[PDB]
Amino acid sequence: DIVMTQSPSSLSVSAGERVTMSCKSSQSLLNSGNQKNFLAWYQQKPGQPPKLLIYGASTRESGVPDRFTGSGSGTDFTLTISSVQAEDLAVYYCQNDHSYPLTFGAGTKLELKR
- Classified as helix, coil or strand, 88 is helix
Among 16, 33, 46, 101, binds a copy of itself (CB under 8 A): 101
| Minimum separation from the CB atom of position 16 to a copy of itself (A) | 28
∠ at Cα 57 (65, 98), nearest 5°?
Answer: 125
Interaction of residue 22 with a copy of itself, rule CB under 8 A: no
| Minimum separation from the CB atom of position 106 to a copy of itself (A) | 6
Interaction of residue 105 with a copy of itself, rule CB under 8 A: yes
38 contacts 31 by C-beta, under 8 angstroms: yes
| Minimum separation from the CB atom of position 82 to a copy of itself (A) | 22
94 contacts 106 by C-beta, under 8 angstroms: no
The 68-87 contact track toward a copy of itself, x by CB under 8 A, reads: --------------------
43 contacts 50 by C-beta, under 8 angstroms: yes
Among 50, 79, 81, 110, binds a copy of itself (CB under 8 A): 50
Interaction of residue 24 with a copy of itself, rule CB under 8 A: no
Spatial separation of the C-alpha atoms in residues 48 and 23, rounded to whole Å: 22
38 contacts 96 by C-beta, under 8 angstroms: yes
Positions that interact with a copy of itself (CB under 8 A):
48-52, 55, 61-62, 93, 100-107
